[PDB]
Ligand binder design. Structure first.
Ligand SMILES: CC(C)COC(=O)c1[nH]c2ccc(F)cc2c1-c1cn(CC2CCN(CCNS(=O)(=O)c3ccc(CC(C)C)cc3)CC2)nn1
Length: 329
C-alpha cells in the first residue's frame, strides 16, 4: 500500500501534550445563558451554520452568534476544543461563549465581532502591499495553529475576516480542523473544491499541516493574478486536471510514484500529458501591479504536489516577498 508520511515540523506536538488537549471526544462543554444575546441581523449561511450579528444585553457589546446545524456531538466538541486551545493566538477568532437555545436546543457559538461588510469592493482595490501585509497576518495564524498541533483544512478567502478600517484580520470557521497525529489517516473530503490539495484529490490520507499551505497558494494566486478561482475545476477529478495543466504532469506522476499512491482508474483517461507552465502566462496588463519576481518565487514554493516540499508557514514568513511588511513591524 501507500508509503507513510509525517510532517516536517511540529510532528509530535500533540504526543507531548496531556490527553485532554486533543482527545476532544471527552471534552465537556461549558454552556451559558442564551438569554444574554439578542440577534440583530443575519450575516451569512452555509451547509453547517448560520451566522448572526448580535448584542450581549449584559454589556451592550456587539457580537457574532454562529448557530450550528445538526452534526455529530463530537464534531461540535472538536470545533469547541480547537477554538479554546487556540484562544488568544495571533489573528485567531476568539470564541467568547457557548450557548444552547432552551426550547430548540440547537447549540450556538458566540464570537468576537469583526467588521467586514466591505469585502466586495476591498477585494478589487487591494494594493500589492495590502496583499503582502494580509498574507503575513494569515501566516501568523497558520504558524500558531500548526505549532499548536492543529490543521485548519478549510483555508480560503471567505474564511478570512478583514476589517480594513483597522487593518485587522481573523481566521474563522474551525469546523473542519483536526489535530495532527503522526501516522494518522484523515478524511480526504475536506475544504472547498478550488482549494483542495493534490493529496486530497488523489486520496492520500496521511497528510498534515502542509495541506493548509497549498490552500494559501491558491488564495495568493487568485489575488495576484486577479483570477477567482485560480484552478477552476468542474469537480474533484477535473480539479486535479486543472492543476496538472499548470504544474505539469511529470511532477504529478513523480509524486504518485514516490508515495506509491493508487490512482483512481478514472484519472486514466483525463490527466493527459502537460508541461509545467511558466507563471508569466497568467500576467496581463490588469494584474501586473500585484505581480513581482518575489511574489512568483513565493507562489511557486507553495504550490507543489509533494506536500513535504511545500514551504512551512514559518518558512513562508521569511520569504523576500515579505521583507517590506516585516520592516514596518
Ligand atoms: C458564513 C458561514 C457559512 C460561516 O460563518 C462563520 O463561520 C463565521 N464565523 C464568524 C465569527 C466571527 C465573525 F465576526 C464572523 C463570522 C462568520 C462569518 C461568515 N461570514 C460570511 C462571509 C465572510 C467573508 N466575507 C468576505 C471574504 N473575506 S475578506 O473580504 O475579508 C478577504 C479579503 C482579502 C483576502 C485576500 C488575502 C490576501 C487575505 C481574503 C479575504 C464575505 C462574507 N460573515 N461572518
Amino acid at each position: 500500500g501507500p508509503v507513510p508520511s509525517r510532517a516536517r515540523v511540529y510532528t509530535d506536538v500533540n504526543t507531548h501534550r496531556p490527553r485532554e488537549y486533543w482527545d476532544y471526544e471527552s471534552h465537556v462543554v461549558e454552556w451559558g445563558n442564551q438569554d444574554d444575546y439578542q440577534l440583530v441581523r443575519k450575516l451569512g449561511r452555509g451547509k453547517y451554520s448560520e451566522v448572526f450579528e448580535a448584542i450581549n444585553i449584559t454589556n451592550n457589546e456587539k457580537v457574532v452568534v454562529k448557530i450550528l446545524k445538526p452534526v455529530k456531538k463530537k464534531k461540535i466538541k472538536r470545533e469547541i476544543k480547537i477554538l479554546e486551545n487556540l484562544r488568544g493566538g495571533p489573528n485567531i477568532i476568539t470564541l467568547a461563549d457557548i450557548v444552547k437555545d432552551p426550547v430548540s436546543r440547537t447549540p450556538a457559538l458566540v464570537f468576537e465581532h469583526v467588521n467586514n461588510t466591505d469585502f466586495k469592493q476591498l477585494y478589487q482595490t487591494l494594493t500589492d502591499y495590502d496583499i503582502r501585509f494580509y498574507m503575513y497576518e494569515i501566516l501568523k495564524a497558520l504558524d500558531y495553529c500548526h505549532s499548536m498541533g492543529i490543521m485548519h483544512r478549510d483555508v480560503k478567502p471567505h474564511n478570512v475576516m478583514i476589517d480594513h478600517e483597522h487593518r485587522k484580520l481573523r481566521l474563522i470557521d474551525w469546523g473542519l480542523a483536526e489535530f495532527y497525529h503522526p501516522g494518522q489517516e484523515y478524511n480526504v473530503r475536506v475544504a472547498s473544491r478550488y482549494f483542495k490539495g493534490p493529496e486530497l484529490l488523489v486520496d492520500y490520507q496521511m497528510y498534515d499541516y502542509s495541506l493548509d499551505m497549498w490552500s494559501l497558494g491558491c488564495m495568493l494566486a487568485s489575488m495576484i493574478f486577479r483570477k477567482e478561482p485560480f484552478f477552476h475545476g468542474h469537480d474533484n477529478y477535473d480539479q486535479l486536471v486543472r492543476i496538472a495543466k499548470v504544474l505539469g504532469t511529470e511532477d504529478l506522476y513523480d509524486y504518485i510514484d514516490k508515495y506509491n499512491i493508487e490512482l483512481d482508474p478514472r484519472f486514466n483517461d483525463i490527466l493527459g500529458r502537460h508541461s509545467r507552465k511558466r507563471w508569466e502566462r497568467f500576467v496581463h496588463s490588469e494584474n501586473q501591479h500585484l505581480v513581482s519576481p518575489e511574489a512568483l518565487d513565493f507562489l511557486d514554493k507553495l504550490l507543489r504536489y509533494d506536500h513535504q516540499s511545500r514551504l512551512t508557514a514559518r518558512e513562508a514568513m521569511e520569504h523576500p516577498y515579505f521583507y517590506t511588511v516585516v520592516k514596518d513591524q
